[PDB]
Amino acid sequence: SMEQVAMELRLTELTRLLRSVLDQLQDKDPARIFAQPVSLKEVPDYLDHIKHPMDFATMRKRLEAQGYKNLHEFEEDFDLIIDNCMKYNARDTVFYRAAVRLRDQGGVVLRQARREVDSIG
């Protein structure tokens, strides 16, 4: 049907917008702290602490399968990246501090993405 096609075109254009958001977020992480999964071969106790690991490469895989149906879903995964880091690592560490700074800088990016998603429909 044409109605199904229109919903597909909408999902594709959301995917386009979320790609640009993901690139912008990732630019706020030049050290690439959040680029790849934590390896269970080097924080071997990681999964006893953190139930839902998340990272930018994992988000990019989901995005390329048009796997985010709305901005809220994408935001949830970004918040997992930040929140997991703030739990596992102490307040005095480079990792925790990098998560704080990414959250603050990412706030700006996400704020405008919400207005664009709402405005375009």
Ligand code: NA
């Ligand atoms: Na902690």
